[PDB]
Amino acid sequence: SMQIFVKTLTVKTITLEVEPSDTIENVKAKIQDKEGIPPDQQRLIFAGKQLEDGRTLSDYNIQKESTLHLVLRL
Amino acid sequence: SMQIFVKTLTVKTITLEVEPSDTIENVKAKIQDKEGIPPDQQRLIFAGKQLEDGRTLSDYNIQKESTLHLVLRL
């Protein structure tokens, strides 16, 4: 009869396949391919630091099964 | 070649087909059908007010194409 919309906000953990030498920028692109989030809205955080696009995961000693935090720009 | 995890707060907006006389409990039942969230783990919000199970969409003046907000609770 009638349609309503429900906007949901959940805690979600995504898994990515990466190389220690991938840049933060390449990681944001992989997040886009999986979530449809453009890279310019993505803020990636590890151990309290904002991750810089032009650096690699190894630059931040992001190892296997490390967990990044993704926060979106408003 | 490694696996990493990215934890994010993800926004998903769902559409529901309802009648103005549907109870909130009936609406949560439809959310379960489409997202698999049981009604007691659902915190359903309209216009900043938490919606009560025994009340209808009309009671809260929820009209066509209205948007509700949902977060998960234990």
Numbering used by the authors:
A (entry chain A), B (entry chain B): 0 to 73
Paste lines from the article.
To investigate whether Ub74 G10V resembled the UbV.XR dimer, we determined the structure to a resolution of 2.23 Å from crystals grown from the dimeric gel-filtration fractions. Polder maps (Liebschner et al., 2017) confirm that the electron density for the β1β2 loop clearly extends between two adjacent chains such that β1 interacts with β2′ on a neighboring chain to form a β sheet. The complementary chains in each dimer pair have a complete elongated β1 strand. The dimer interface comprises around 1,800 Å2 of an overall accessible surface area of ∼6,000 Å2 for each subunit. There appears to be a certain degree of freedom around the dimerization arm, producing two distinct populations of dimers in the asymmetric unit. The first population consists of the chain pairs AB and IJ, which superpose with a root-mean-square deviation (RMSD) of 1.55 Å for 2,139 atoms, and the second population consists of chain pairs EF, KL, and GH, which all superpose with an RMSD of less than 0.8 Å for ∼2,000 atoms. The main source of divergence between these two populations arises due to differences in rotation between the two Ub bodies in the dimer subunits. The populations differ quite dramatically, with angles of 144° for AB, 159° for CD, and 163° for EF. A theoretical scattering curve calculated from the crystal structure fits well to the solution data with a χ2 value of 3.8 compared with the crystal structure of Ub74, which fits with a χ2 of 20.8, and the crystal structure of the Ub74 G10V dimer was easily superposed with the envelope calculated from the solution scattering data. A crystal structure of Ub74 G10V shows that the dimer interface resembles that of UbV.XR, and SAXS analyses suggest this dimer conformation is also present in solution.
Ubiquitin (Ub) is a small 76-amino-acid protein that functions as a post-translational modifier on a wide range of substrate proteins in the eukaryotic cell. Because Ub uses a common surface to interact with a wide variety of proteins with relatively low affinity, it is an attractive scaffold for engineering variants with greater specificity for select targets (Ernst et al., 2013, Leung et al., 2017). Using this method, we unexpectedly identified a dimeric UbV that is selective for the RING domain of XIAP (hereafter referred to as XR) (Gabrielsen et al., 2017). Using solution angle scattering and X-ray crystallography, we show that a single substitution of residue Gly10 to either Ala or Val is sufficient to convert Ub from a monomer to a dimer.
